[PDB]
Chain A
């Protein structure tokens, strides 16, 4: 029997089987229902909901890493099991991922849905950042996970996230796409609609990068064309992307670019380390692991290496690890964990759930 691994992303669901090195299914975390509520299908999920966007209202049930609509989330899980993986959930132990600092009521509800709606024989809920740390071959370190709707700094000691020291940044890939649409619109172009947001998300993924020295790069962009790249729009028009290539992910280091008063990812990394025991801080500085789609920017690890070095004591050994597969490291970490023999001792069984109810997840999963 194969365990299932479902990474409930704010923007993308990554799902598959434990023991595999990549998810079998990657699809948008959206649910689409017909616009007229006061009325040949009641609802649509993922790729099909996007294809039929002309007749449905689309919603993100996990917009900022936290599940807010349980009816839409159940539709996502049903789609994942039956339509993407084509499995009967009652035959497979299932590992689900959750956001760092996920509310107790939320993880209880997720546990109840798995056992009562899907009748899984066993399940476990793991924090996404912990799984990415496992995918790097580590059990202690600090993960910077930046996805679609949320970013977190998660320090981890021997497989256990330290919630008192977790930092959350309410800015991630979606906000970077919105900011890129704004600064391209400032040039006379128009990127405003949901469909235009998708074109700009493509521009962002293909041409953006993190500058090693932002002011130096801004000066270079203004004195030459050496950093310019051309992009062909769907209408055949050609747009030149210049300083926008590095101004867009600079927002991770300078959230004031989008009107946010928060510290940047390098400052929240330092703050998160400092909230941990003195004894572990050297191990965290030497094991900074980058994860998630919004850490894919070229230059991001060298910039984080420079920024953390500038903050830390000059003798501190600092290391940034940015795996090539970091877009899928949460999923890969879950596949690693659920394929180990120690996992059978960690899962919550239906018997345990029947005895203790949903609050069993507080005791067993951390």
Chain B
């Protein structure tokens, strides 16, 4: 039951635990269905747990692009981006001028509006009772509002909540003392819906099947834009209250492990079958924590790296056209570490699978020519054979194949017929060979390239034959020696012989 592919070893999860996620499970089910229908793997950055009810209410808009003012983690504005950044997280409170300018510029550039903040009864109960973020509400008889303070952030600031009816909903409007006077609390809202922005569903990565990879149809990412539209359509929010936004903000020089994990991944349903990670290899839920809604929960960088490898192995990859930040505190995120196992296995397989004689010019024996051909250690056999009149081996490596070449075999090599040897090859010293290239009649080559034929898994070897005015120069490489190296060597010796009228 253990998953094994090269250096990737995954052991079954003993006692699967339930992991808390910020994304409402109704939307997790939607994203699981989108991954199946679209045949893609979608990764979504964690949503802050405390913002779940805000998203579940389906009343708000979500964080769009070009908003550099940050959210608050305290008071009744928790989970929203206050226009007055003194009400935001500690990093904004200690850099007021910088953050207040970001909020103001977001409005001035048409990227946000200043909106009123209404909270539902669920939110008031969460802040008072579940999280104890606010002190119990106390009716202030003069204004008719309920006063409360935050139990974190600045505990000296009073907030005032007023019961209002907004489009048939009984909500609580947030008010505060602005320059000492009661005023409606303002948050950054979306420019088209005018509704406050909560956290959005920030896509971490999208991995597509091979068929969906390739050049774009941009006649000036379209696939990612199209997928985001399918997601928003399937999420079914009112127009203007979308959870996913087209485009993406800068990578940002920040880390925080809570901003990247636990990430929720959504995958095609075939990953959940018994042969999910391959024939008899097990289902993805055996090695990764998957909930009832089909969300694959990735808790840390090692799990993210392992999940990415399983997806890559299953032929799902991030696009060339798409831009992702995905990683953060990288264990082995380089391209060289995430290579497909089909690529590495094929490379390993290929590396394994690839492995009266006249006096010679000078007058000092033909054996010196054989010694020359055998010197660089690339060849196991070499021969110089006269082919005119009665053919004979002038010189050859003793105890090898070429020394036994016959006149019948020479006749096939130099014969007029250049097609019968394609039926089942030819022999050289009795050794069966296949013809790879017959360039015997090509000017400037006068050569034939062959490869021996053998039984089972016994090695085979490349052979080149080059024809001169009176001789055939034959060479056989050792195991693994490329045919081009042998052809070049045979060509060079043949040229030398042709220069001396041989």
Q: Is the CB of B432 within 8 A of A279?
A: yes
Which listed residue (B215, B336, B422, B453) contacts A26, Cβ 8 A? B215
Q: Is the CB of B215 within 8 A of A324?
A: no
Residues of B within 8 A of A158 (CB): 353, 451, 460
Which listed residue (B336, B350, B435) contacts A340, Cβ 8 A? B350
Q: Is the CB of A51 within 8 A of B218?
A: yes
Q: Is the CB of A24 within 8 A of B215?
A: no
Least Cβ distance of B339 to chain A in Å? 5
Interface residues of A in 349-366 (CB under 8 A from B): 352, 359-360, 362-366
Q: Nearest residue in A to B317 (C-beta to C-beta)? A: A22
Least Cβ distance of B422 to chain A in Å? 6
* Most interface-central of A160, A164, A335, A363 (chain B CB within 10 A): A363
Residues of A within 8 A of B423 (CB): 277-278
Interface residues of B in 308-360 (CB under 8 A from A): 315, 317, 320, 335-336, 339-340, 342-343, 345-351, 353-354
Q: Is the CB of A134 within 8 A of B346?
A: yes
Cα A24 to Cα B317 with chains together (Å):
13
B424 within 8 Å of A (CB atoms): yes
Would A328 and B215 be within 8 Å (CB), given that A336-B346, A342-B482, A362-B439 are in contact?
Answer: no
B425 within 8 Å of A (CB atoms): yes
Cα A336 to Cα B349 with chains together (Å):
10
Which listed residue (A51, A164, A342, A365) contacts B422, Cβ 8 A? A164
Interface residues of B in 444-498 (CB under 8 A from A): 444-445, 449, 451, 453, 460, 462, 480, 482-485, 487-488, 491
Q: Is the CB of B453 within 8 A of A279?
A: yes
Q: Nearest residue in A to B314 (C-beta to C-beta)? A: A324
List the one stretch of A135-143, A169-177, A185-193, A253-261 in contact with chain B. Answer: A135-143
Q: Is the CB of A346 within 8 A of B485?
A: yes
What is the interface size of chain A, counting residues whose CB is below 8 A from a CB of the partner? 62
Which listed residue (B350, B445, B449, B482) contacts A345, Cβ 8 A? B482
Cα A136 to Cα B350 with chains together (Å):
9
Which listed residue (B210, B349, B483) contacts A160, Cβ 8 A? B483
Interface residues of A in 268-285 (CB under 8 A from B): 275-280
Would A324 and B346 be within 8 Å (CB), given that A279-B432, A364-B484, A365-B484 are in contact?
Answer: no
Least Cβ distance of B177 to chain A in Å? 53
Would A24 and B218 be within 8 Å (CB), given that A336-B347, A366-B483 are in contact?
Answer: no
Interface residues of A in 154-171 (CB under 8 A from B): 157-160, 162-165
Would A359 and B444 be within 8 Å (CB), given that A139-B353, A165-B422, A327-B210 are in contact?
Answer: yes
Cα A16 to Cα B114 with chains together (Å):
49
Would A346 and B482 be within 8 Å (CB), given that A277-B422, A278-B423, A328-B210 are in contact?
Answer: yes
A27 within 8 Å of B (CB atoms): yes
B180 within 8 Å of A (CB atoms): no
Residues of B within 8 A of A53 (CB): 219
Q: Is the CB of A325 within 8 A of B491?
A: no
Cα A160 to Cα B438 with chains together (Å):
13
Residues of A within 8 A of B217 (CB): 198, 202
Q: Is the CB of A363 within 8 A of B487?
A: yes
Q: Is the CB of B488 within 8 A of A364?
A: yes
Q: Is the CB of B353 within 8 A of A324?
A: no
A181 within 8 Å of B (CB atoms): no
Q: Is the CB of B491 within 8 A of A276?
A: no
Q: Is the CB of A24 within 8 A of B482?
A: no
Cα A276 to Cα B215 with chains together (Å):
37
Q: Is the CB of B488 within 8 A of A366?
A: no
B434 within 8 Å of A (CB atoms): yes
Cα A353 to Cα B215 with chains together (Å):
35
Which listed residue (A136, A278, A324, A364) contacts B210, Cβ 8 A? A324
Cα A228 to Cα B138 with chains together (Å):
64
B209 within 8 Å of A (CB atoms): yes
Cα A352 to Cα B491 with chains together (Å):
13
**Interface class of chain A by DSSP:** mixed
1/0 per residue, CB under 8 A from B, across A178-218: the answer is 00000000000000000100100010010000000000000
Q: Is the CB of A26 within 8 A of B214?
A: yes
Cα A135 to Cα B488 with chains together (Å):
27
Which listed residue (B215, B218, B449) contacts A366, Cβ 8 A? B449
Residues of B within 8 A of A123 (CB): none
Cα A195 to Cα B220 with chains together (Å):
13
Q: Is the CB of A26 within 8 A of B485?
A: no
Cα A346 to Cα B215 with chains together (Å):
32
Least Cβ distance of B391 to chain A in Å? 24
A50 within 8 Å of B (CB atoms): yes
Q: Is the CB of B215 within 8 A of A137?
A: no
A296 within 8 Å of B (CB atoms): yes
Least Cβ distance of B219 to chain A in Å? 6
Least Cβ distance of A244 to chain B in Å? 19
Residues of A within 8 A of B220 (CB): 51
1/0 per residue, CB under 8 A from B, across A45-64: the answer is 00100110100000000000
A12 within 8 Å of B (CB atoms): yes
Q: Is the CB of A163 within 8 A of B315?
A: no
Cα A145 to Cα B325 with chains together (Å):
36
Least Cβ distance of A271 to chain B in Å? 13
Which listed residue (B342, B348, B349) contacts A323, Cβ 8 A? B342
Residues of B within 8 A of A91 (CB): none
Least Cβ distance of A122 to chain B in Å? 13
Cα A11 to Cα B345 with chains together (Å):
29
Least Cβ distance of A310 to chain B in Å? 24
B253 within 8 Å of A (CB atoms): no
Which listed residue (B210, B320, B354) contacts A325, Cβ 8 A? B210
Residues of B within 8 A of A325 (CB): 210, 315, 340, 342
Q: Is the CB of A342 within 8 A of B436?
A: no
Which listed residue (B215, B219, B343, B449) contacts A12, Cβ 8 A? B215
Residues of B within 8 A of A90 (CB): none
Q: Is the CB of A139 within 8 A of B350?
A: yes
Residues of B within 8 A of A305 (CB): none
Residues of A within 8 A of B347 (CB): 336, 339-340
Q: Nearest residue in A to B350 (C-beta to C-beta)? A: A134
Least Cβ distance of B1 to chain A in Å? 25
* Most interface-central of A22, A25, A337, A339 (chain B CB within 10 A): A22
6 A-B contacts (beta carbon < 8 Å) = A202-B217, A324-B209, A324-B210, A327-B214, A345-B482, A363-B491
Extra contacts, 8 of them, besides A139-B354, A340-B351 (Cβ < 8 A), are A47-B215, A47-B216, A138-B349, A279-B432, A327-B210, A339-B347, A342-B354, A345-B482
Top-9 shortest CB links A-B: A137-B349, A364-B484, A137-B346, A21-B343, A324-B315, A139-B353, A278-B424, A363-B488, A21-B340
